[PDB]
Amino acid sequence: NNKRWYFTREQLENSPSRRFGVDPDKELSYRQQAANLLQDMGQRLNVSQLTINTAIVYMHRFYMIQSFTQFPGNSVAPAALFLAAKVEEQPKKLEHVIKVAHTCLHPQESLPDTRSEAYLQQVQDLVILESIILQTLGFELTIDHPHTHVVKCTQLVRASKDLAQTSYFMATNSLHLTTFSLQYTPPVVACVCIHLACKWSNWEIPVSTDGKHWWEYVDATVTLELLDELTHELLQILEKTPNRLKRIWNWR
Amino acid sequence: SVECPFCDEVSKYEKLAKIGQEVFKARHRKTGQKVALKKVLMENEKEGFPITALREIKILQLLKHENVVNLIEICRTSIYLVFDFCEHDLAGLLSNVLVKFTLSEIKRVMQMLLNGLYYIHRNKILHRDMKAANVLITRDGVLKLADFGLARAFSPNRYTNRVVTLWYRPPELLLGERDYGPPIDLWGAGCIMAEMWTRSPIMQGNTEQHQLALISQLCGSITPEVWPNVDNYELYEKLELVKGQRKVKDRLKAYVRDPYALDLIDKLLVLDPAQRIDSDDALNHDFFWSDPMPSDLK
């Protein structure tokens, strides 16, 4: 059901990984590293950011049920991506995905002979892992991403190509860097991203004659208290991330 | 071993009897509720979990409606899709002489059918396998569209061409069309409607040419006057096309008799996909709104 893959902050604290002796903070790293590996492979495999995003949500959800101590990010990322590419109608061949995973994880090794018993074996490992992901997600694979809603929002509120560009950037980074996708609906996250993007660009969208703030047309539940709270978290993690902000920094 | 909150083991259901030839009729061990378990096939599956099953699962999870088959859950051990069990199907009932529908009831069947189509198309899904054998009727006389393993979401588009069982496959596809839409399902709806009286698939080709010939001997012939722009298909100039030839209403005049039924069928089995009536207008046709009025099933 609806409330199934959204978790409270206390639920996020007592995660499967926590039960096996992983710090809150270590676990957060394990997730960010998975999102990075997913982004690197996806770029090399030439799948869309959408597929990459979908794979990131799978990974996020998969680790609310499973522990990093039992399933390594470096094993789950490729499988999640292999699956997400099928689901988003950009199937990549199994052998192909294994090969790109290998170069990312081991730039200096050289692929085993595709005839070796040890390579036939790593193919079998991925297939087994994909099946475990499907069962962990209970075959719920249709993912909604904030990006859909950013376009809607930043457009109907008359934003420069620029402002819109910064909002998508934030949306993409909220997946790599945070667990918002486990806590807030995509329409809310989109508001969070547009909000920070405005703040980052010194832009303010004017209050309507009715007295309605822009976001009330996006999600009726959303409050400024919450918007400011979440943008602050997102901005803080962005600051801890080397070069990430440089990408949107107005250098003129 | 590994935790699994959201995928139940299929052992919760008790296997009663093979059907598909792996599809089983089964009984929930606690409640007795009868269901159908369809194993997901794994022969020649070289690329992990079959993209065709992912797609179907994706669509079934989306489509929730009184006239669309209902996927209850997915179960592990293989992997099984669980459906509400349904005893009958339009193909079985129509090929069964003891079974008899009144005109009042036929109206109800087409009504439910068209409503199912209207709904799935509304959700940007093409069924792509319209045939009597894919239409279910539940013990309570409720019609459900079933078998979405060949269905596809829709939105110059280049969709797959070898789709829909041959006898129900529309002119467009039999001419090499790849930018088609919901009308392909409506053509199939037509073939099923006529089948409600004739008790047998009206057009039984053996090859693509044989099917296209049969269509011409019924709908008149493929003509740029009748079907604006038809001659842009390279498979039109190539393959054999007849000349002279409209007999939709005469050949069916026998079985049906009712004016309205014949008029709708003429509008479903229309050559130009863009002039073929859609689910919304069909439901609105006088056939469902003149006497006798549509009645429930038993």
Curated annotation (Swiss-Prot), chain A:
User: Where, per UniProt, does this protein localize?
Assistant: Nucleus
| Residue positions where Phosphoserine is found in the record | 110
Query: Tissue-wise, where is it found?
Result: Ubiquitously expressed.
Q: How does the record describe the protein's post-translational processing?
A: ADP-ribosylation on serine residues by PARP1 in response to DNA damage disrupts the phase separation activity of CCNT1, thereby preventing activation of CDK9.
Oligomeric form and interacting partners: Cyclin-T1 is the predominant cyclin that associates with CDK9 to form a heterodimer called P-TEFb. P-TEFb forms a complex with AFF4/AF5Q31. Component of a complex which is at least composed of HTATSF1/Tat-SF1, P-TEFb complex, RNA pol II, SUPT5H, and NCL/nucleolin. Component of the 7SK snRNP complex at least composed of P-TEFb (composed of CDK9 and CCNT1/cyclin-T1), HEXIM1, HEXIM2, BCDIN3, SART3 proteins and 7SK and U6 snRNAs. (Microbial infection) Interacts with the transactivation region of HIV-1, HIV-2 and SIV Tat.
Role description: Regulatory subunit of the cyclin-dependent kinase pair (CDK9/cyclin-T1) complex, also called positive transcription elongation factor B (P-TEFb), which facilitates the transition from abortive to productive elongation by phosphorylating the CTD (C-terminal domain) of the large subunit of RNA polymerase II (RNA Pol II). Required to activate the protein kinase activity of CDK9: acts by mediating formation of liquid-liquid phase separation (LLPS) that enhances binding of P-TEFb to the CTD of RNA Pol II. (Microbial infection) In case of HIV or SIV infections, binds to the transactivation domain of the viral nuclear transcriptional activator, Tat, thereby increasing Tat's affinity for the transactivating response RNA element (TAR RNA). Serves as an essential cofactor for Tat, by promoting RNA Pol II activation, allowing transcription of viral genes.
Q: What is known of its domains?
A: The histidine-rich domain (HRD) region is intrinsically disordered and promotes the formation of phase-separated liquid droplets that enhance binding of the P-TEFb complex to the CTD (C-terminal domain) of the large subunit of RNA polymerase II (RNA Pol II).
Q: Record's family?
A: Belongs to the cyclin family. Cyclin C subfamily.
Q: What is this protein called?
A: Cyclin-T1
* UniProt organism field: Homo sapiens
Curated annotation (Swiss-Prot), chain B:
Cite the record's note on assembly.
Answer: Component of the super elongation complex (SEC), at least composed of EAF1, EAF2, CDK9, MLLT3/AF9, AFF (AFF1 or AFF4), the P-TEFb complex and ELL (ELL, ELL2 or ELL3). Associates with CCNT1/cyclin-T1, CCNT2/cyclin-T2 (isoform A and isoform B) or CCNK/cyclin-K to form active P-TEFb. P-TEFb forms a complex with AFF4/AF5Q31 and is part of the super elongation complex (SEC). Component of a complex which is composed of at least 5 members: HTATSF1/Tat-SF1, P-TEFb complex, RNA pol II, SUPT5H and NCL/nucleolin. (Microbial infection) Interacts with the acidic/proline-rich region of HIV-1 and HIV-2 Tat via T-loop region and is thus required for HIV to hijack host transcription machinery during its replication through cooperative binding to viral TAR RNA.
Record-stated family: Belongs to the protein kinase superfamily. CMGC Ser/Thr protein kinase family. CDC2/CDKX subfamily.
Enumerate the UniProt keywords alphabetically: Acetylation, ATP-binding, Cytoplasm, DNA damage, DNA repair, Host-virus interaction, Kinase, Nucleotide-binding, Nucleus, Phosphoprotein, Serine/threonine-protein kinase, Transcription, Transcription regulation, Transferase, Ubl conjugation
**What does the UniProt record say this protein does?**
Protein kinase involved in the regulation of transcription. Member of the cyclin-dependent kinase pair (CDK9/cyclin-T) complex, also called positive transcription elongation factor b (P-TEFb), which facilitates the transition from abortive to productive elongation by phosphorylating the CTD (C-terminal domain) of the large subunit of RNA polymerase II (RNAP II) POLR2A, SUPT5H and RDBP. This complex is inactive when in the 7SK snRNP complex form. Phosphorylates EP300, MYOD1, RPB1/POLR2A and AR and the negative elongation factors DSIF and NELFE.
Catalytic activity entry? L-seryl-[protein] + ATP = O-phospho-L-seryl-[protein] + ADP + H(+); L-threonyl-[protein] + ATP = O-phospho-L-threonyl-[protein] + ADP + H(+); [DNA-directed RNA polymerase] + ATP = phospho-[DNA-directed RNA polymerase] + ADP + H(+)
Start and end residues of each Protein kinase domain:
13-288
Top-level EC class, please?
transferase
Effect ascribed to mutating residue 38 to R: Decreased acetylation; leading to enhanced protein kinase activity
What is the protein's given name? Cyclin-dependent kinase 9
Q: What is the effect of changing residue 38 to Q?
A: Mimics acetylation; leading to impaired protein kinase activity
- InterPro entries assigned: CDK (IPR050108), Kinase-like_dom_sf (IPR011009), Prot_kinase_dom (IPR000719), Protein_kinase_ATP_BS (IPR017441), Ser/Thr_kinase_AS (IPR008271)
From what organism does this protein derive?
Homo sapiens
* A Gene Ontology molecular function term of the record: cyclin-dependent protein serine/threonine kinase activity
Gene that produces this protein: CDK9
Reported disease:
Chronic activation of CDK9 causes cardiac myocyte enlargement leading to cardiac hypertrophy and confers predisposition to heart failure.
**Impact after mutating residue 34 to R:** Impaired kinase and transcriptional elongation activities, but normal cyclin T1 and HEXIM1 binding
